[PDB]
From Swiss-Prot, chains A, B, C:
Note from the entry: Serum levels of MIF are elevated in patients with severe sepsis or septic shock. High levels of MIF are correlated with low survival. Drugs that inhibit tautomerase activity protect against death due to sepsis.
Keyword Ribosomal protein: no
Gene name as annotated: MIF
InterPro entries named among the record's database cross-references: Macrophage_inhib_fac, Macrophage_inhib_fac_CS, Tautomerase/MIF_sf
Catalytic activity from the UniProt record: 3-phenylpyruvate = enol-phenylpyruvate; L-dopachrome = 5,6-dihydroxyindole-2-carboxylate
Protein name (database record): Macrophage migration inhibitory factor
Subunit architecture: Homotrimer. Interacts with CXCR2 extracellular domain. Interacts with the CD74 extracellular domain, USO1, COPS5 and BNIPL.
Keywords: Acetylation, Cytokine, Cytoplasm, Immunity, Inflammatory response, Innate immunity, Isomerase, Secreted
Enzyme Commission number: 5.3.2.1, 5.3.3.12
GO terms of molecular function: chemoattractant activity; cytokine activity; cytokine receptor binding; dopachrome isomerase activity; identical protein binding; phenylpyruvate tautomerase activity; protease binding
Location of the protein in the cell: Secreted; Cytoplasm
Reported induction: Up-regulated in concanavalin-A-treated lymphocytes. Up-regulated in macrophages upon exposure to M.tuberculosis antigens.
Length: 117, 117, 117
């Protein structure tokens, strides 16, 4: 199925989030997952009270929930992509980023008054 | 056990969140799960920077973590309920909502200086 | 591997969050998990619109994602620790706290352009 969602939490200021970033994340993830952009959801949360390694330089905590398209090599590619994007667009060092991956069962994803199973 | 928690993240403005909405979610979920309202926790996050399908009309990303009471049919009923509530109260179209469901092991839920196992 | 991350969401005001709290959480969790503080990430979210049991006294919803070091007894110790910290520092009653525990596969944790597997 086509469902995937990406969340990034960061201490980086809202002003540093470029315009079009939501569409950028959406479409890059659509390319990466082989899912249509219409069912990719994205959520960016700046100005958070956060630390990585006990210090407060720019950092991010992210998650990608997806129905399928999750696994070792795939997650490696996603990590390369997303760390690249966060470094280029949000000035965050890749070694200060965690991304948690979740392969969701269709039956555990609600949408449009039902689930995807 | 009685533990369940619901989170909704949305780009909908804080002003559009009606008064009593937390209690409404709590009690509707208590009905739905057959759990006492005293152990239902609720978290609503408005004004978020979000997109669904690459566009920023009202949308929501939600999760329901629960000890038990999670599964295909149950999740379908929850989705009908919650999409209904989000549409009625938050003006969000049900086809712009994801709800992730999690059946949590008692041993993986901390509360009151211990866990539920 | 060394990766662990902790998030706490609470309705408690930002002003009630003491200075040094991020480092405190980081180091206490480093002690608790036997992981180096350099790979512990922490995220604190105050002033949230939240309820526990349908009422809005101070409460928290937290999560600890970790590569390993998760299980029954361990989670009990973590819960004692974290509820203690939240009560002492954030004035939150331990019976109004949920902490969800996640043992993450190395292959499902992205960091530094790759994963931990």
């Amino acid at each position: 199925p086509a469902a995937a969602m990406f969340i990034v939490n960061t201490n980086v200021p809202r002003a540093s989030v470029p315009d079009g970033f939501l569409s950028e994340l959406t479409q890059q993830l659509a390319q990466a997952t082989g899912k249509p952009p219409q069912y990719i959801a994205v959520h960016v949360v700046p100005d958070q009270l956060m630390a990585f390694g006990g210090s407060s330089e720019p950092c991010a905590l992210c998650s990608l929930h997806s129905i399928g398209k999750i696994g070792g090599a795939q997650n490696r590619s996603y990590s390369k992509l997303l760390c690249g994007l966060l470094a280029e667009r949000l000035r965050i060092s890749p070694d200060r980023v965690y991304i948690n991956y979740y392969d969701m069962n269709a039956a555990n994803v609600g949408w449009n008054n039902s689930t995807f199973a």
